[PDB]
PDB file of C-alpha atoms and ligand atoms in Angstrom:
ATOM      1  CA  UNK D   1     -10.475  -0.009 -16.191  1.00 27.07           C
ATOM      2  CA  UNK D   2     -10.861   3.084 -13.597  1.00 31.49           C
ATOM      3  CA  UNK D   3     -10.108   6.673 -15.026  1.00 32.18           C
ATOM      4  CA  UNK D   4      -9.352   9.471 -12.071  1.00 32.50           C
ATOM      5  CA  UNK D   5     -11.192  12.235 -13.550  1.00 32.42           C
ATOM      6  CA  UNK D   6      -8.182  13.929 -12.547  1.00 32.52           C
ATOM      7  CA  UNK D   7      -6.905  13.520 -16.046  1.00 29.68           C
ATOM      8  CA  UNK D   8      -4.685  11.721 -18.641  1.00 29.61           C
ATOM      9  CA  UNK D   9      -1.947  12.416 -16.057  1.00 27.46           C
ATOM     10  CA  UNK D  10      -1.247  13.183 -12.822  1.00 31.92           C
ATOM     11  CA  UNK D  11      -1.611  17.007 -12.357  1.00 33.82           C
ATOM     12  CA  UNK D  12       1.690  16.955  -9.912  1.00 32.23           C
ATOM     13  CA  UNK D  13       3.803  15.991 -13.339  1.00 31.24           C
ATOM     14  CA  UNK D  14       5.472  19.095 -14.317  1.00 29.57           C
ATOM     15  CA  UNK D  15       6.563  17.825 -17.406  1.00 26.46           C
ATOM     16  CA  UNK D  16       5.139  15.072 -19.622  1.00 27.55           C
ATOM     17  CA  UNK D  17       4.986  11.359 -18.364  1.00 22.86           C
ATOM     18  CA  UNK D  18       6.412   8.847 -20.636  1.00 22.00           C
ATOM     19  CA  UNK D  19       3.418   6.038 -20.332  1.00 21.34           C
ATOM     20  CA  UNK D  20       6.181   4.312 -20.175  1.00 19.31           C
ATOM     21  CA  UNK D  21      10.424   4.221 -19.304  1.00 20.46           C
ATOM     22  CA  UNK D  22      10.947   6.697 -16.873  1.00 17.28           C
ATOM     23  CA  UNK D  23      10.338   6.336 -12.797  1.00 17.36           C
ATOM     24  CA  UNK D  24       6.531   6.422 -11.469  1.00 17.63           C
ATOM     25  CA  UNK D  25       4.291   5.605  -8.398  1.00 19.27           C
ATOM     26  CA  UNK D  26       2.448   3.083  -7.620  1.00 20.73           C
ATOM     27  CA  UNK D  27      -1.008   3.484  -4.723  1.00 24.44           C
ATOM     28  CA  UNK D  28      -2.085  -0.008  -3.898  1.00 25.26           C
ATOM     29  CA  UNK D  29      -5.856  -0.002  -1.815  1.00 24.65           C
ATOM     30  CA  UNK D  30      -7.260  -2.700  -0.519  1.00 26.08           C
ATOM     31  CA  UNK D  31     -11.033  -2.843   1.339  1.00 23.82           C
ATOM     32  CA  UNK D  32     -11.738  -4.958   4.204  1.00 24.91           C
ATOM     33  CA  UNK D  33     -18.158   4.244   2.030  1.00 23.55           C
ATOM     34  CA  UNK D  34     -16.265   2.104   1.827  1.00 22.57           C
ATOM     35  CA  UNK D  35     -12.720   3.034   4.178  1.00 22.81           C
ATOM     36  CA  UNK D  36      -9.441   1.414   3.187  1.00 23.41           C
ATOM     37  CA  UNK D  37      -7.586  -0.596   5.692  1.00 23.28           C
ATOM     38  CA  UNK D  38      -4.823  -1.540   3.024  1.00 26.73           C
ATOM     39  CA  UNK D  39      -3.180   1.390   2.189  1.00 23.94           C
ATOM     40  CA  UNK D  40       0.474   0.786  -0.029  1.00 22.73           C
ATOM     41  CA  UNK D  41       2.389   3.414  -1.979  1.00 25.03           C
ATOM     42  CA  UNK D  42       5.351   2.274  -4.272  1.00 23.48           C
ATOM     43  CA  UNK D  43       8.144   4.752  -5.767  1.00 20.65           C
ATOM     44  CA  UNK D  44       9.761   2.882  -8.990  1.00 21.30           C
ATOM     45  CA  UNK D  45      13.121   4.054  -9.839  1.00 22.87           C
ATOM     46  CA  UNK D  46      13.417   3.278 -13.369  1.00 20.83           C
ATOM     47  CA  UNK D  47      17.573   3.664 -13.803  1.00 20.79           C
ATOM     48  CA  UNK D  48      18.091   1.950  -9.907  1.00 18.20           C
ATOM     49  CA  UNK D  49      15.819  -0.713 -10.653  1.00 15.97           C
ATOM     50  CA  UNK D  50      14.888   0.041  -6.718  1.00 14.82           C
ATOM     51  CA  UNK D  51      11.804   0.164  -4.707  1.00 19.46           C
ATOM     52  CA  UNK D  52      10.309   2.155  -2.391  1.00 14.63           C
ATOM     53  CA  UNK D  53       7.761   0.535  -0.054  1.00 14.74           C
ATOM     54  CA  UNK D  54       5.959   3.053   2.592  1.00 16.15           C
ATOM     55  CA  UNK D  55       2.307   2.473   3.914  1.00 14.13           C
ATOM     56  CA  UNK D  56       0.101   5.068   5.161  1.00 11.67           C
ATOM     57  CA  UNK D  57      -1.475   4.930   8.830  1.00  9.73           C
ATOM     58  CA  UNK D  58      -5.131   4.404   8.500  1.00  7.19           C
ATOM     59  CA  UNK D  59      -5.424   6.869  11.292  1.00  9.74           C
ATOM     60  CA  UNK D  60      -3.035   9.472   9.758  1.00  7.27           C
ATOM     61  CA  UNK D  61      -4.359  13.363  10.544  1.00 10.27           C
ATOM     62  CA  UNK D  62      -4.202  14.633   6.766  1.00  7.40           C
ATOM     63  CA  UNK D  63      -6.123  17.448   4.903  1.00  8.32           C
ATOM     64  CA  UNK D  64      -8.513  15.331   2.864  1.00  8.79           C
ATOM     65  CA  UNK D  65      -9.589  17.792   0.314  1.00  7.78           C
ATOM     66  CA  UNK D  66     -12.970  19.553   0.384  1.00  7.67           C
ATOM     67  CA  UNK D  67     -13.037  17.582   4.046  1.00  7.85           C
ATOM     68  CA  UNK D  68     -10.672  19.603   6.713  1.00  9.70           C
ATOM     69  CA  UNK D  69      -8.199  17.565   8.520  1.00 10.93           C
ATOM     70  CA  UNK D  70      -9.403  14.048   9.294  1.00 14.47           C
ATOM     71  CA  UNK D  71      -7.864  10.538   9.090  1.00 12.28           C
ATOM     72  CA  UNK D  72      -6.331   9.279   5.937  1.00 11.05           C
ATOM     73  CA  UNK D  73      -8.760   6.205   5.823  1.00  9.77           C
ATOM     74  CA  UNK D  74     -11.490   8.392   5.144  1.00 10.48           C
ATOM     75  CA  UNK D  75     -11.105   9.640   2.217  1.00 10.89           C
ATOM     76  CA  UNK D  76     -11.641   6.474   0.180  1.00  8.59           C
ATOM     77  CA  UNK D  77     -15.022   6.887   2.664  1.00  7.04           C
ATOM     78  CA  UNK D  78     -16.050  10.419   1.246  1.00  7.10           C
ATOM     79  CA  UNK D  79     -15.382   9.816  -2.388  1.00  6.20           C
ATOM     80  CA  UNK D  80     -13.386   6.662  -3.159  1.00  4.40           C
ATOM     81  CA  UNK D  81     -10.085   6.375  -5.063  1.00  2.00           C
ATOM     82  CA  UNK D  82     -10.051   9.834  -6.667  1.00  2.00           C
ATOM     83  CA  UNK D  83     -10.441  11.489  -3.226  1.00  2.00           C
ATOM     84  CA  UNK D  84      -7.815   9.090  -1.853  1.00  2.00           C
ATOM     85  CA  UNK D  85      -5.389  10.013  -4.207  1.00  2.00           C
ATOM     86  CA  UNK D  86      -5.992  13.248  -4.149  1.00  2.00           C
ATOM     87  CA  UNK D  87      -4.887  13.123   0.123  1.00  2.00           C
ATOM     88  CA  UNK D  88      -1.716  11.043  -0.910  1.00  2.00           C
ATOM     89  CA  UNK D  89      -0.807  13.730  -3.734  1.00  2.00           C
ATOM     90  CA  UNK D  90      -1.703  16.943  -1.113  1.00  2.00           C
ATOM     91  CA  UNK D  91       0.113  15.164   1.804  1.00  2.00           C
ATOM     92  CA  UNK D  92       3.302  13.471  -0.266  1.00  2.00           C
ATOM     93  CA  UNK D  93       3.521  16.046  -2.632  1.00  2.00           C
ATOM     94  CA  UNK D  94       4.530  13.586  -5.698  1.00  2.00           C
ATOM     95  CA  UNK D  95       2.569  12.365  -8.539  1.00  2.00           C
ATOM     96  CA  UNK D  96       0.283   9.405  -7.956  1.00  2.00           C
ATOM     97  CA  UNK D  97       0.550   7.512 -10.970  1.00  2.00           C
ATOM     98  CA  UNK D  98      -1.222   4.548 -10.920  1.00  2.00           C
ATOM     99  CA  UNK D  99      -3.708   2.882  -8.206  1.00  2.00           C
ATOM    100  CA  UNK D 100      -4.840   0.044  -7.976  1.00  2.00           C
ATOM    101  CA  UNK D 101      -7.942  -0.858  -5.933  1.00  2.00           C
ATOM    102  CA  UNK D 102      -8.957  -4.542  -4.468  1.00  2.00           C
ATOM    103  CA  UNK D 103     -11.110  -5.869  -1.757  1.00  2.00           C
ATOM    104  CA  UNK D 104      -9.305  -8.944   0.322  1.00  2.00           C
ATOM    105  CA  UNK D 105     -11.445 -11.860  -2.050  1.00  2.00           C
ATOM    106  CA  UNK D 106      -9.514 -10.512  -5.040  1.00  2.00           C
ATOM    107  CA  UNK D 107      -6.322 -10.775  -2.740  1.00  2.00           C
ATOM    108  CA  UNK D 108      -6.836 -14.382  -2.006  1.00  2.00           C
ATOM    109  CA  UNK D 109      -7.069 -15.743  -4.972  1.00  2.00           C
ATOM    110  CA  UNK D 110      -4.278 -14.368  -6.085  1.00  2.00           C
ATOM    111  CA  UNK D 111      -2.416 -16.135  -3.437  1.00  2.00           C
ATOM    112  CA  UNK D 112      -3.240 -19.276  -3.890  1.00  2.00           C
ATOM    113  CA  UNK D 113      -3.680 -18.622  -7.148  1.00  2.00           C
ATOM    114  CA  UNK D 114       0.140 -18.296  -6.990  1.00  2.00           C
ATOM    115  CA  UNK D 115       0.196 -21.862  -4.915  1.00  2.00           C
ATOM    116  CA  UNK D 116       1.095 -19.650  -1.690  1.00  2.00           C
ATOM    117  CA  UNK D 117       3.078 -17.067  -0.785  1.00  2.00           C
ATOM    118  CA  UNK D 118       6.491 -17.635   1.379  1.00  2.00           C
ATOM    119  CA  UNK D 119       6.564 -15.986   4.517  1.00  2.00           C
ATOM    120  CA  UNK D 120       8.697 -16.700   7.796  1.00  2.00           C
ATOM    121  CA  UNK D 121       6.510 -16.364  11.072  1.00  2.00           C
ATOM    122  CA  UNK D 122       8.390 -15.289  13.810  1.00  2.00           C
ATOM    123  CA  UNK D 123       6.148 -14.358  16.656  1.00  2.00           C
ATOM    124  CA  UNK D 124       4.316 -16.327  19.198  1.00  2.00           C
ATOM    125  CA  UNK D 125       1.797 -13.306  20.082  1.00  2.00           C
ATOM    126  CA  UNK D 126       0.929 -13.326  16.326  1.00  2.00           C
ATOM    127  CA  UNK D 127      -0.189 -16.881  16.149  1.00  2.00           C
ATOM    128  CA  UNK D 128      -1.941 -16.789  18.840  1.00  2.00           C
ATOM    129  CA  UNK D 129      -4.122 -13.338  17.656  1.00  2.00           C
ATOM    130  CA  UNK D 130      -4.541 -15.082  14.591  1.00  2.00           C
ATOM    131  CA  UNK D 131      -5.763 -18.087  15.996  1.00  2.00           C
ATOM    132  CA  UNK D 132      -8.302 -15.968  18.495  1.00  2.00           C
ATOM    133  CA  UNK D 133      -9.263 -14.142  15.533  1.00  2.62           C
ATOM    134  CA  UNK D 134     -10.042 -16.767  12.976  1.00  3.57           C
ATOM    135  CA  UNK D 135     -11.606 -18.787  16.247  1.00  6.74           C
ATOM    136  CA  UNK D 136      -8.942 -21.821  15.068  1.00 11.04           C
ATOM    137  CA  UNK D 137      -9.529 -21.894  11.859  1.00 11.10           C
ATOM    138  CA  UNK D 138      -6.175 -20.592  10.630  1.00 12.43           C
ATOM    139  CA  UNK D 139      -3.183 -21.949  12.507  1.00 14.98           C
ATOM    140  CA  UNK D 140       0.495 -20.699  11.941  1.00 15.07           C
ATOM    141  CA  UNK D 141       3.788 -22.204  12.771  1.00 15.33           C
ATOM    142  CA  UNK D 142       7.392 -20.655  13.481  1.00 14.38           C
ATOM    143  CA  UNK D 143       9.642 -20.278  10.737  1.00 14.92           C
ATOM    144  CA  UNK D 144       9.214 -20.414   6.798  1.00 15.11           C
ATOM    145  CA  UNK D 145       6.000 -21.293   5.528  1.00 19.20           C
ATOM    146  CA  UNK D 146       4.139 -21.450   2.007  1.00 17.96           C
ATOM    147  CA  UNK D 147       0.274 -19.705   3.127  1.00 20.11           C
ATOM    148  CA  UNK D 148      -2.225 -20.390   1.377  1.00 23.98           C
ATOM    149  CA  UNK D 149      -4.601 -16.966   0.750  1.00 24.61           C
ATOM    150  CA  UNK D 150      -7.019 -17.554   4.067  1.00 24.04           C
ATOM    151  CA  UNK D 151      -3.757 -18.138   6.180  1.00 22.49           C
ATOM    152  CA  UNK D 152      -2.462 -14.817   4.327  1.00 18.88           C
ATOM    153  CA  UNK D 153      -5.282 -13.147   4.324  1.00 20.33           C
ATOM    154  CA  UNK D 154      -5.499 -13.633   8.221  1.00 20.07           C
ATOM    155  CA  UNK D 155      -1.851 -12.644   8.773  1.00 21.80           C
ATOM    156  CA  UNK D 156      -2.714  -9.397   6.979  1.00 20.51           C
ATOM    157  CA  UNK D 157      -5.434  -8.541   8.902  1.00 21.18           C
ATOM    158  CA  UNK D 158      -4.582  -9.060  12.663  1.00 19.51           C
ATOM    159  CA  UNK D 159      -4.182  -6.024  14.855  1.00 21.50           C
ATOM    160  CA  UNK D 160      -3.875  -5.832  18.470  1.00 18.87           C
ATOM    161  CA  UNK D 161      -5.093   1.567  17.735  1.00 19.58           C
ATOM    162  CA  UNK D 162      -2.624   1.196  15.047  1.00 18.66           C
ATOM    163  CA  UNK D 163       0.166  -0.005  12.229  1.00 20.92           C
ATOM    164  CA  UNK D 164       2.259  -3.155  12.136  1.00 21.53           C
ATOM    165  CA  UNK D 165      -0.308  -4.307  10.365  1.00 19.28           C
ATOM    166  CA  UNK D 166       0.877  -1.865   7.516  1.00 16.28           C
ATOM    167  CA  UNK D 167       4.025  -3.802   7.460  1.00 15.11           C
ATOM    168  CA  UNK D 168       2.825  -7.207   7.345  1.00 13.09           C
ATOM    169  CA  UNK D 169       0.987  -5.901   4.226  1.00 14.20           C
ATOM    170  CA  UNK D 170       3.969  -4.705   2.904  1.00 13.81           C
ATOM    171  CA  UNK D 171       5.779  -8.288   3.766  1.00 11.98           C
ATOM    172  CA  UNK D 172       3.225 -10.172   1.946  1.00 10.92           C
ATOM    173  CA  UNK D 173       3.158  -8.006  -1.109  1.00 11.46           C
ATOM    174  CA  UNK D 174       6.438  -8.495  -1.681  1.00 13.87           C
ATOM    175  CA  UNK D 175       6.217 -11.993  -0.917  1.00  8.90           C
ATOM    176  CA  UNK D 176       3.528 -12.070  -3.770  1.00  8.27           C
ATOM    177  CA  UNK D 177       5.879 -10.356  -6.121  1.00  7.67           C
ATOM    178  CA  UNK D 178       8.443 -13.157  -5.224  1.00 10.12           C
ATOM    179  CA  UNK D 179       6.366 -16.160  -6.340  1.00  9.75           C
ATOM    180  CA  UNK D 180       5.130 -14.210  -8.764  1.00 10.42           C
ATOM    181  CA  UNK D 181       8.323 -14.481 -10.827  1.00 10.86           C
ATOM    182  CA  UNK D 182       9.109 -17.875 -10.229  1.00 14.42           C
ATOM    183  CA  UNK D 183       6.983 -18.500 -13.278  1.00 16.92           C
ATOM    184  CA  UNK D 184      -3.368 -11.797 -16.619  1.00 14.45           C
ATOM    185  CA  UNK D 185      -3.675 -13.915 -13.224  1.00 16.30           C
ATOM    186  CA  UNK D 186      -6.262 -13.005 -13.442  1.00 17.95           C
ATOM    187  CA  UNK D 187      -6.338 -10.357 -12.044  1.00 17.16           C
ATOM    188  CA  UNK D 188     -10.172  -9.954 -11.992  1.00 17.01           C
ATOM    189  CA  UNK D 189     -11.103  -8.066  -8.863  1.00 14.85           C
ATOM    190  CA  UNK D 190      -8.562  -5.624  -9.668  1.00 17.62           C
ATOM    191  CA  UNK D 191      -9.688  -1.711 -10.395  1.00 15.45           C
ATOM    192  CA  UNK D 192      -6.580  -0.022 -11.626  1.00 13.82           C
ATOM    193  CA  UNK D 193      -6.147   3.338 -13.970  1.00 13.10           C
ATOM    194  CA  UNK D 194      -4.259   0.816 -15.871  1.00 11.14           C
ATOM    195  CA  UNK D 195      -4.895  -1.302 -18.793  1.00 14.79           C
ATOM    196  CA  UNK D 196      -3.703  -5.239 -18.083  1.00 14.09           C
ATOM    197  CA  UNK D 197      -1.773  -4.841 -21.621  1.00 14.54           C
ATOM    198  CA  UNK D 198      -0.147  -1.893 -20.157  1.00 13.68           C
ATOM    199  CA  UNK D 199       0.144  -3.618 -16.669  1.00 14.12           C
ATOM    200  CA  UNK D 200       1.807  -6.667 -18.215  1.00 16.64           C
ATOM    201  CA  UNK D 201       4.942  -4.881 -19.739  1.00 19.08           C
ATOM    202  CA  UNK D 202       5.984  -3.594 -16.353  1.00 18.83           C
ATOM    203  CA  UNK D 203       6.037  -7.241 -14.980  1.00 19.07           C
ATOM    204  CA  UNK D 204       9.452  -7.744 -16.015  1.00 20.21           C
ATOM    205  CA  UNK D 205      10.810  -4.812 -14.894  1.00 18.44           C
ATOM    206  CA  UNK D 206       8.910  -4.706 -11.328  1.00 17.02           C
ATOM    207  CA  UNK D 207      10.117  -8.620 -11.103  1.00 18.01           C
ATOM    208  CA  UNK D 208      13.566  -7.453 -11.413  1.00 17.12           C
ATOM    209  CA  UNK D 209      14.302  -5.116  -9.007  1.00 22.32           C
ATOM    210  CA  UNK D 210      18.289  -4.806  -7.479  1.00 21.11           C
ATOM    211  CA  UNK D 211      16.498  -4.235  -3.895  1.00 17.13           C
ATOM    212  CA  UNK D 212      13.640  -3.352  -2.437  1.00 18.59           C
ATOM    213  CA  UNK D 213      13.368  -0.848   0.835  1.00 21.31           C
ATOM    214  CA  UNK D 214      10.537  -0.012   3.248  1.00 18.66           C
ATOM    215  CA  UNK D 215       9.694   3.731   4.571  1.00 17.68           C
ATOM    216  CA  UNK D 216       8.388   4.799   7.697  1.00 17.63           C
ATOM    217  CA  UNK D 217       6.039   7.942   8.789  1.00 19.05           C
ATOM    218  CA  UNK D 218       6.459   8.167  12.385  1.00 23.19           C
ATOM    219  CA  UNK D 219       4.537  10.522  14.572  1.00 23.20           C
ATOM    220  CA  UNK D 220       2.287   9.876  17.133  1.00 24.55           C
ATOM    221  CA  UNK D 221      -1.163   9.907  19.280  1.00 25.74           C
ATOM    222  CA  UNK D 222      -3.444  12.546  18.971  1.00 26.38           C
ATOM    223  CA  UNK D 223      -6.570  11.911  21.137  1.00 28.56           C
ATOM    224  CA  UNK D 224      -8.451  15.449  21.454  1.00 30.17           C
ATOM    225  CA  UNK D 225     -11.540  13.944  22.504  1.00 29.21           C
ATOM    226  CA  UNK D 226     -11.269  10.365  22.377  1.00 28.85           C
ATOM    227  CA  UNK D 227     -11.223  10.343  18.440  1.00 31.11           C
ATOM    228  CA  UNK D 228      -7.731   8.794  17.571  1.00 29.70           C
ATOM    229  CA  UNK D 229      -5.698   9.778  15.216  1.00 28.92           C
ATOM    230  CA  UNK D 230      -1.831   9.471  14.160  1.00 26.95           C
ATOM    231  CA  UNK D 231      -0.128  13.057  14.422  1.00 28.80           C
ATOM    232  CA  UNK D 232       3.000  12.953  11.676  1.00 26.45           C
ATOM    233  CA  UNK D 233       6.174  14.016  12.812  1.00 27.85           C
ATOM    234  CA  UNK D 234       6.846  16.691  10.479  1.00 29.44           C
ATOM    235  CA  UNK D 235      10.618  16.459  10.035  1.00 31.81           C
ATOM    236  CA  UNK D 236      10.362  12.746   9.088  1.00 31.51           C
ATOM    237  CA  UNK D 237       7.720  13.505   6.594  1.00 27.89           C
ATOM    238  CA  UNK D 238       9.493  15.975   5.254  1.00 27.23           C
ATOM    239  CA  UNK D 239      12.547  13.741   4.976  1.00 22.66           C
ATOM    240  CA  UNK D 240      10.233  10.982   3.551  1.00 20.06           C
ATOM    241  CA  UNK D 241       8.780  13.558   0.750  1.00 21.38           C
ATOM    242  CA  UNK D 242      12.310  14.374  -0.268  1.00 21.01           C
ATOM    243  CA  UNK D 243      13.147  10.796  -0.844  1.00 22.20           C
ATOM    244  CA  UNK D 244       9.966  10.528  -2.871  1.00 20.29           C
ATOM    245  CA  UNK D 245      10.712  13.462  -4.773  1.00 16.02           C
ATOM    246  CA  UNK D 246      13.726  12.412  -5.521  1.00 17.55           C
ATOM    247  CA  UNK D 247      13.236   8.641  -6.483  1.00 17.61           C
ATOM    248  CA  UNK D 248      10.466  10.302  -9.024  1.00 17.48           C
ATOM    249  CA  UNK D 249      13.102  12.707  -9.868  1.00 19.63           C
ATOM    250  CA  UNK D 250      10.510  15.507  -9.637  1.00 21.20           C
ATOM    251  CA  UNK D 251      11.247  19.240  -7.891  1.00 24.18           C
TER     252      UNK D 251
HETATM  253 CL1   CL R   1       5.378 -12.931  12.783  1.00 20.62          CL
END
């Protein structure tokens, strides 16, 4: 049961947060000192019932506090999930209200844990990286597929410097929140700032969504001397932070 030391709530929150029926954020992290390669942040609009999916580039030029500019995925590096969502709250500019930290065991047990998740492979280039990567030992097919968690936790990992891989984490996820409510887990791995009583009252509600939508920070390569990292466009995040703000119904 983690506790930011940031607090009872997140200091963004103008206003007091109802634990509790009103719209919040969600920061999924997954790893694998140490850096996270799974980086997820959910908006929950309470009166929509809508989602808001949008995953951060691991190479992402952001201030991390007390750090100077450096990429996003380093911050979980220089002091783990309270620095982390520190850089999401400085670089969004909307509460962080929950996070949730796992490394990829935790993930696959869940998975099959759930008897597979559903997912429709499209791409010839993917099975083949997938099959280079895992040296054979995980082998996809076209179309729509139950995975069991090493076939999902190879899809989720495959990369050809950058993100596509944030989106097949953001397929999967929802995939998992799918078969999830055709039915703790546990639920064991799992560090969250939340309590699994507290966790298990929003089930229904996040397993009843009207629709749920992706977002995108696009930018792009920023090589001063060879280090890489992902320049954001600034009117698109800007645009994105709105939407945020708004979906929170903070500002
Ligand atoms: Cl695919």
């Amino acid at each position: 049961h983690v506790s930011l030391a940031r607090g009872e709530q997140s200091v963004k929150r103008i206003k007091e947060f109802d634990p509790g029926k009103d719209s919040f954020s969600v920061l999924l992290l997954g790893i694998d000192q140490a850096r996270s390669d799974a980086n997820v942040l959910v908006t929950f609009n309470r009166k929509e019932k809508t989602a808001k999916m949008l995953s951060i580039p691991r190479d992402a030029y952001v201030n991390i506090p007390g750090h100077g500019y450096d990429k996003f995925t380093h911050a979980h590096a220089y002091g783990g999930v309270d620095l982390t969502v520190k850089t999401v709250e400085e670089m969004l500019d909307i509460p962080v209200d929950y996070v949730v930290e796992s490394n990829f065991t935790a993930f696959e047990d869940v998975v099959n844990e759930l008897n597979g998740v559903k997912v429709t492979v499209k791409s010839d280039k993917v099975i083949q990286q997938i099959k280079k990567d895992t040296k054979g030992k995980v082998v996809l097919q076209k179309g729509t597929h139950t995975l069991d968690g090493e076939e999902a936790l190879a899809y989720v990992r495959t990369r050809k410097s950058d993100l596509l891989r944030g989106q097949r984490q953001m397929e999967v996820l929802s995939a998992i929140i799918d078969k999830s409510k055709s039915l703790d887990t546990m639920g064991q791995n799992l560090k969250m700032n939340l309590s699994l009583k507290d966790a298990i009252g929003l089930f229904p509600f996040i397993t009843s969504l009207k629709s749920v939508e992706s977002i995108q920070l696009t930018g792009y390569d920023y090589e001063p001397a060879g280090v890489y990292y992902f320049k954001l466009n600034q009117q698109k995040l800007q645009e994105v932070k709105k939407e945020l703000q708004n979906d929170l119904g903070v500002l």
